[PDB]
Design an enzyme around this catalytic site. Structure first.
Site, PDB file in Angstrom:
ATOM      1  N   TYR A 130      34.508 -24.768 -19.502  1.00 48.35           N
ATOM      2  CA  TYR A 130      35.599 -23.898 -19.066  1.00 48.35           C
ATOM      3  C   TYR A 130      36.805 -23.955 -20.012  1.00 48.35           C
ATOM      4  CZ  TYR A 130      33.117 -24.606 -14.573  1.00 48.35           C
ATOM      5  OH  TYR A 130      32.194 -24.760 -13.567  1.00 48.35           O
ATOM      6  N   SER A 200      29.846 -18.966  -9.003  1.00 53.48           N
ATOM      7  CA  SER A 200      29.331 -19.673  -7.818  1.00 53.48           C
ATOM      8  C   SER A 200      30.388 -19.662  -6.715  1.00 53.48           C
ATOM      9  CB  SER A 200      28.900 -21.135  -8.141  1.00 53.48           C
ATOM     10  OG  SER A 200      28.173 -21.794  -7.068  1.00 53.48           O
ATOM     11  N   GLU A 325      18.749 -16.220 -10.968  1.00 46.45           N
ATOM     12  CA  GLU A 325      19.744 -16.925 -10.162  1.00 46.45           C
ATOM     13  C   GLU A 325      19.140 -18.108  -9.418  1.00 46.45           C
ATOM     14  OE1 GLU A 325      22.910 -16.838  -9.998  1.00 46.45           O
ATOM     15  OE2 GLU A 325      23.481 -14.939 -10.960  1.00 46.45           O
ATOM     16  N   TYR A 328      16.887 -22.900 -10.887  1.00 43.75           N
ATOM     17  CA  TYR A 328      17.132 -24.346 -10.933  1.00 43.75           C
ATOM     18  C   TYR A 328      17.161 -24.971  -9.543  1.00 43.75           C
ATOM     19  CZ  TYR A 328      22.224 -25.069  -9.693  1.00 43.75           C
ATOM     20  OH  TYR A 328      23.439 -25.193  -9.053  1.00 43.75           O
ATOM     21  N   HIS A 438      21.251 -20.170 -12.975  1.00 43.95           N
ATOM     22  CA  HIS A 438      22.587 -19.981 -12.420  1.00 43.95           C
ATOM     23  C   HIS A 438      23.685 -20.804 -13.099  1.00 43.95           C
ATOM     24  CE1 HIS A 438      25.678 -19.119  -9.408  1.00 43.95           C
ATOM     25  NE2 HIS A 438      25.898 -20.421  -9.344  1.00 43.95           N
TER      26      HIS A 438
HETATM   27  N1  LIG Z   1      24.081 -24.205 -13.034  1.00 47.21           N
HETATM   28  C1  LIG Z   1      24.806 -25.139 -12.372  1.00 47.21           C
HETATM   29  C2  LIG Z   1      24.244 -26.474 -12.059  1.00 47.21           C
HETATM   30  C3  LIG Z   1      25.097 -27.454 -11.325  1.00 47.21           C
HETATM   31  N2  LIG Z   1      26.362 -27.134 -10.954  1.00 47.21           N
HETATM   32  C4  LIG Z   1      26.936 -25.934 -11.210  1.00 47.21           C
HETATM   33  C5  LIG Z   1      28.237 -25.677 -10.797  1.00 47.21           C
HETATM   34  C6  LIG Z   1      28.818 -24.440 -11.064  1.00 47.21           C
HETATM   35  C7  LIG Z   1      28.119 -23.443 -11.741  1.00 47.21           C
HETATM   36  C8  LIG Z   1      26.814 -23.648 -12.175  1.00 47.21           C
HETATM   37  C9  LIG Z   1      26.196 -24.867 -11.931  1.00 47.21           C
HETATM   38  C10 LIG Z   1      24.575 -28.832 -10.980  1.00 47.21           C
HETATM   39  C11 LIG Z   1      23.057 -28.884 -11.095  1.00 47.21           C
HETATM   40  C12 LIG Z   1      22.610 -28.318 -12.436  1.00 47.21           C
HETATM   41  C13 LIG Z   1      22.832 -26.812 -12.482  1.00 47.21           C
END
Ligand SMILES: Nc1c2c(nc3ccccc13)CCCC2
Ligand SMILES: *[C@@H]1O[C@H](CO[C@@H]2O[C@@H](C)[C@@H](O)[C@@H](O)[C@@H]2O)[C@@H](O[C@@H]2O[C@H](CO)[C@@H](O)[C@H](O)[C@H]2NC(C)=O)[C@H](O)[C@H]1NC(C)=O
Ligand SMILES: *[C@@H]1O[C@H](CO[C@@H]2O[C@@H](C)[C@@H](O)[C@@H](O)[C@@H]2O)[C@@H](O)[C@H](O)[C@H]1NC(C)=O
Ligand SMILES: Nc1c2c(nc3ccccc13)CCCC2
Lengths: 528, 526
Positions: A130, A200, A325, A328, A438
């Site tokens: 960020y 998110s 999306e 993961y 995501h």
């Molecule tokens: N893509 C994300 C992942 C994690 N946290 C996140 C937090 C915000 C936005 C994307 C995220 C933790 C687990 C791994 C993936």
């Protein structure tokens, strides 16, 4: 001493730092306190404005992260550690950051305000991904990001109580947004062109600020990336909030709402975090314990109710999703999944995972999900099954919430732009079967590929520069297009663009066939 | 006298007629009495076997059509008149037909037995399009067709009563099949290789004979064309049957079951026919007042339960559908439709038609249908909406019942072959948008294109001969056989029948029929 790095804001004097960019120098003011530390008796209470200070607060490094669970699923893995806290945890964490061009601007400069995601249980403005410096230097904006309380510290609610009213993390954000109105000019920002953007839970929060009148005078344009206030995970009802606050007290040895919160406040913050996930009614993915509560205060109705009833003329919104999306999330509880094998699940595992991805619904609802997402010519193909469960979780939690918001806002006066982000980062460490997971568009929006210390390709750098232009154009004008062209999203044509290394391609429908199921039919079934 | 046209059956002596065909002579025995006329006090009762006669019955023309509604929506239009009766109506209608080669075969020849459709309210073996002469002369089989009572006269039921027990039309069929076993050899037929085949309600009846043990010793193989016993229109429950029987009675001036049926028997047949459609509970298409009733006798359970529970090892079955099962049904009650314009309906009309095509379901159920059949990137395209309502009606009433039947039979021991019939006849007079409508494969199975007086193309004649070979091959061997593979629940293979060679494809509307067969029942119980 460098006068460009001394700023006086209403609370007192600040000393900043000069930062290098591959382009030019940028001024950064990191760790500016905007609230009184919500410690001790102030845990769970709305934030109180920061009392003024004598002397000069050193805003030269990131302050602490708000107390939050830390991902331990894959210790050392870049794919999870990039989201973990990269500063000490503290409840004394309500600080915000300002990045501005060097030297500080002449004329009012347009302001971007970033709200991080992380399911309302995690996140921090200090994360590398960020970093404001590239957007500021390249597109001549002022960028502000804030820390806001997460997990129980931000969203534990005993509805009706003075002692734990809920949504205080949301109020942290609002306080920061108020701070921006009163002080951003001191850095050259234009308080009359503030654009909110988040991802998110941060995108859900942007949306909640759209739907809460006290927040709505604090900014002008909105960007929601892979999140929405109307997602099944982003709000909770009063009763369930009370049940979850109450189970947490029981799990930590507590104990009258006042007697209960009193006891919660005597527990170490880390103790609350350790029991955070156990309050959930069901094993699930993409569900989070302490999220915003619909109690008639901050949100006078549900976000979906408020969307359908809103006059949204004069609002421009940028919304979108990444290609995969849901991918993961499956390795955090869907049976048979791993980041380390191909996750070629069996049909029985698929059916099991459908109950984990769509939790707390009737068996009929689950069957309706299984009906829509099965190819009845290949009911047991493992690859198709893995892809379909990802689509279930992604459609149910992000894509179809976002599509609904976009369509209703568009049909009710807002000018909407929609994108699908379809580029997999060359640097990505999650397996190839997860696609574009995501969150992995944020690094390009913030321009991280321009960092030479990082090993992105020459085309990815240009791609990142295009994205920053799109976002900044939207901030300045309400239109991402350069003054092939990107059309507004409408409820009829449902046009969106794909962002990748190829030029803009306009397409129709954000998973229209699936999102008719989640937005039009499945509500009706759930009421009978 | 011509010795080839005299046969003796258990009832007495019969005199036939020699028929000319494009490929040679055929012996035809048309109008053989197989039951006592179900008249007067015998209206509504099970058929009673024909009592033997002295002398020689002339079986030289088609007998009368059983009393039925006559279609008048398009008076004079061949597309409707071809299904309307082509003999006088009478309750004295229980006759059957036998076609056999000339001279009669001297070795036992396999038998095809035809059951006509018409929604259980209409139809006849007399119709031109079921002419047995061409199948017989081309594949050297014996072909039998029978009349069975339709409408109230065949299927009005006051369940539990001896006076109107219901399903008597099916028992007419069963009696004819018993007739075939005791007498077909007298024409050269082999009672140990009999294949039932029918269409619409005739296909549903073929299925009900599979699932009722008393019928099951009377045939060996089955063909179901565009119909199935588990279709939502093919059976009715006891209570609803009684409600329709009773409303029909009230509507014609009749008040004790025996006293109610008694009063019905004094009403002129035509009076009953005139009130047939009024007992239907709802505005609808593809629904018929008097159909088989599930009362534990003829059908011990619903056709789905009996299929899902049945061991079908040692059974060969040929099943299929036409390309556009649902199309014609829409001009009979769906808002915005006509055989005479393009019927490019509005979405508002589409949503209305879904309630007419899927009658008697919950609003929730109606919505579930609208969801699966809307293209949400083109929710209001009139042409897409027209094609979609056709698919709703065809999938719900024909395609998915047949697919469910096929898959369950295959999975429990049966050898199944499945077809989709995709050739639109050059002679068709229905509008081009209806595609290949329900029923317009029959003329090709029966070989009607070989009639020189009819103006089919030389390619349709070849196509008709190919189909007749497939059906007759299935009749003699149980295998119609580029090769036509068995239908199985997994691979769900079927072939396309048209002027091009066999093409193998997968799934009888699999994505749609999962909705109708797997999900929608669950939704209807909650
Ligand atoms: N893509 C994300 C992942 C994690 N946290 C996140 C937090 C915000 C936005 C994307 C995220 C933790 C687990 C791994 C993936
Ligand atoms: C297609 O026709 C239908 C049916 O109309 C009948 O057939 C026509 C060919 C013509 O002869 C009409 O006069 C007949 O009534 C049309 O739907 C009808 O719309 C009228 C409005 O005038 C309405 O009163 C009827 O109830 C409708 N009929 C039904 C069965 O719903 C339809 O609009 C035509 N489609 C076109 C022109 O595109
Ligand atoms: C994929 O992995 C799933 C999770 O198993 C865990 O991770 C793998 C890499 C192994 O180390 C295993 O022992 C761990 O428990 C399995 O449940 C699933 O069956 C795997 N799928 C395969 C191997 O096809
Ligand atoms: N396609 C059919 C039509 C009718 N009856 C039929 C009977 C059996 C098979 C197909 C049929 C009567 C109405 C016109 C259409």
């Amino acid at each position: 001493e460098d006068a460009e790095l001394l700023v006086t804001v209403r609370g007192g004097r600040l000393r900043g730092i000069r930062l290098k960019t591959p382009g030019g120098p940028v001024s950064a003011f990191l760790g500016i306190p905007f609230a009184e530390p919500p410690m001790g008796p102030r845990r769970f209470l709305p934030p109180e404005p920061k009392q003024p200070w004598s002397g000069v607060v050193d805003a030269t490094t990131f302050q602490s992260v708000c107390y939050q669970y830390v991902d331990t699923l894959y210790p050392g893995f870049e794919g999870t550690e990039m989201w973990n806290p990269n500063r000490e945890l503290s409840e004394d964490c309500l600080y915000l950051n300002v990045w501005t061009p060097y030297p500080r601007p002449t004329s009012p400069t347009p302001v971007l305000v970033w709200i991080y995601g992380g399911g309302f249980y995690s996140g921090a403005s200090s994360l590398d991904v960020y970093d404001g410096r590239f957007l500021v230097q390249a597109e001549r904006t002022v960028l502000v990001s804030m820390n806001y309380r997460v997990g129980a510290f931000g969203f534990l609610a005993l509805p009706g109580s003075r002692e734990a009213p809920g949504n205080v993390g949301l109020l942290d954000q609002r306080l920061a947004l108020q701070w921006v109105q009163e002080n951003v000019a001191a850095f050259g920002g234009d308080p009359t062109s503030v654009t909110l953007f988040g991802e998110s839970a941060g995108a859900a929060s942007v949306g909640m600020h759209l739907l809460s009148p006290p927040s709505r005078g604090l900014f002008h344009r909105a960007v929601l990336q892979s999140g929405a206030p109307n997602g099944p995970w982003a709000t909770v009802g009063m009763g369930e909030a009370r049940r979850r606050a109450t189970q947490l007290a029981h799990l930590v040895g507590c104990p009258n709402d006042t007697e209960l919160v009193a006891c919660l406040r005597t527990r170490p913050a880390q103790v609350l975090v350790n029991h955070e996930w156990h309050v959930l009614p069901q094993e699930s993915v993409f569900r989070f314990s302490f999220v915003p509560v619909v109690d008639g205060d901050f949100l006078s109705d549900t976000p979906e109710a408020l969307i359908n009833a809103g006059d949204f003329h004069g609002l421009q919104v940028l919304v979108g999703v990444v290609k995969d999306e849901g991918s993961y999330f499956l390795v955090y509880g869907a049976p048979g999944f791993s980041k380390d094998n191909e996750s070629l699940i069996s049909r029985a595992e698929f059916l099991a995972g459908v109950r984990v991805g769509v939790p707390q619904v009737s068996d009929l609802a689950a069957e309706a999900v299984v009906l829509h997402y099965t190819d009845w010519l290949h009911p047991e193909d493992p690859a198709r099954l893995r892809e379909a469960l990802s689509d279930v979780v992604g459609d149910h939690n992000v894509v179809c919430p976002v599509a609904q918001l976009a369509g209703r806002l568009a049909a009710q006066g807002a000018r909407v732009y929609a994108y699908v982000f379809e580029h997999r980062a060359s640097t990505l460490s999650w397996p190839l079967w997860m696609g574009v997971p995501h969150g992995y568009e944020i690094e390009f929006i913030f321009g991280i590929p321009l960092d030479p210390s990082r090993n992105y390709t020459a085309e990815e750098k240009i791609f990142a520069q295009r994205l920053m232009r799109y976002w900044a154009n939207f901030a300045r004008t309400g239109d991402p297009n350069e003054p092939p062209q990107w059309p507004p999203y409408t409820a009829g044509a449902q046009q969106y663009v794909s962002l990748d290394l190829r030029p803009l391609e306009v397409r129709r429908g954000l998973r229209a066939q699936a999102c008719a199921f989640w937005n039009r039919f499945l509500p009706k079934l759930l009421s009978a």
